[PDB]
Structure formats: C-alpha cells, structure tokens
Ligand SMILES: N[C@H](C(=O)Nc1cncc(F)c1CC[C@@H]1CN[C@H](COC(=O)NCC(F)(F)F)CO1)[C@@H](c1ccc(Cl)cc1)c1cc(F)cc(F)c1
Ligand SMILES: [Cl-]
C-alpha cells in the first residue's frame with residue numbers, strides 16, 4: 001500500500017496474540033509498545049526522544065504482524081504514549097519513504 | 100527519491116540560508132528544530148514525545164527546503180534531541196510511506 005501523511009499513519013498490528021493500533025514511525029529507531037506481557041527473557045533499556053527518556057523492557061525475537069506482513073525483531077515495552085513501529089520492523093516489511 | 104530505513108532517514112534542510120541535518124519522521128505531527136533564530140512573532144506550544152512534553156516556540160509560514168523540495172509552513176523551535184521534519188511538512192513535499 002501507499003500511505004499518505006494527511007493523518008497519523010496508524011495501522012493494526014498483532015503482537016503476543018493481541019490486536020493493537022500502532023503508529024508507523026520513521027523517526028523511531030525501535031518499536032515500543034504500551035504495557036503488556038510478552039514471553040521470554042527481557043533486559044532493561046532507556047530510550048530517548050522528545051521529552052527525554054523512559055525505561056522499558058527489551059524482548060528479543062518477537063514475531064509481529066503489521067498491516068498483514070509478518071516480521072520478527074526486538075520489541076520494547078513500557079510507558080510510551082502511543083504504540084510505535086520503528087525502523088527495526090519497518091525495514092522488514094519493506095517500508096520506504098517516497099517523494 | 101526512495102528512502103529505505105536501514106539507517107535513520109536524515110536529510111539536509113535549508114532554513115534561514117543555513118544547512119542543517121534533520122530526520123524525516125512520520126511519527127511526528129509537527130516539525131521541530133533545535134535552537135536557532137527565526138523571523139517574526141512566535142506563539143506558545145506544548146508537544147509530547149516518548150519522554151513527556153516540552154515547551155516550544157511556534158513560528159508560522161517559515162520557508163524551508165527539505166532534501167531539495169521547497170516548503171513554507173510551521174516550524175517549532177525547542178529542546179528537541181534531533182531536528183525533526185513532521186507530517187505538516189512531509190505532506191508539502193509529497194512524501195508517502197510505501198510497502
Ligand atoms: N502527538 C504526538 C506527536 O506527534 N508529537 C510530536 C510532534 N511533532 C514533533 C515531534 F517530534 C513529536 C514527538 C514524537 C516524535 C515521534 N517520532 C520520533 C520518535 O523517536 C524517538 O523518540 N527517538 C528517536 C529520535 F527522535 F531521537 F531520533 C520523534 O518523536 C504523537 C507521538 C508521541 C510520542 C511518540 Cl514516541 C510518537 C508520536 C502522538 C501522541 C499520542 F498520544 C497519540 C498519537 F496517536 C500520536
Ligand atoms: Cl530488531
């Protein structure tokens with residue numbers, strides 16, 4: 001698909017058996033989801049951006065389905081104001097910016 | 100151009116006759132630049148990011164070139180960690196997300 005940017009590029013994702021809405025964010029290095037349980041090992045991480053830093057849990061090798069495309073990668077879980085799909089997963093679905 | 104996301108989508112911008120580097124950010128509603136002088140009057144604005152909210156100065160109808168494409172619109176100035184080109188200007192340059 002071709003997604004215009006007149007509104008926030010929100011899409012449905014499937015993660016940890018749950019359907020959620022998330023923002024396709026080219027400015028994010030990482031994928032960050034609001035509090036939820038994920039299986040496996042995790043380690044703490046700090047991520048920064050506008051407003052400063054938040055502490056999150058880093059889960060590796062998490063399968064995700066984004067707008068119907070399956071991928072795998074690291075998923076961070078913590079107090080983000082919005083679920084964001086960052087570059088680490090956007091690359092896997094072949095997402096590019098075009099102008 | 101077509102920009103992949105294996106690395107940060109950093110581009111050159113020109114504002115106030117000066118070249119700067121900025122991130123093309125589909126997750127950002129607005130465009131926010133690090134401290135600099137801009138002409139005219141400004142209005143107050145609060146923006147929220149991954150770590151919370153920050154106060155910025157809102158300047159309207161600012162001429163800005165983004166990766167060689169001319170835009171004229173709102174630019175926020177404040178304590179952002181990186182210069183961000185958000186949707187307000189990505190739409191002016193005809194940028195879309197594609198996969
Ligand atoms: N309204 C909010 C917004 O648009 N804020 C905004 C506006 N204009 C310029 C900006 F910059 C911003 C800050 C966000 C941008 C998003 N992409 C980058 C993320 O990357 C890093 O954090 N670090 C990497 C590096 F930036 F440092 F490089 C840079 O921060 C929006 C939002 C809030 C937080 C986040 Cl995370 C993403 C989106 C939102 C809030 C909500 F509650 C519900 C929603 F649907 C949408
Ligand atoms: Cl990853």
Ligand SMILES: [Cl-]
Pocket residue numbers: 094103
């Ligand atoms: Cl590729």
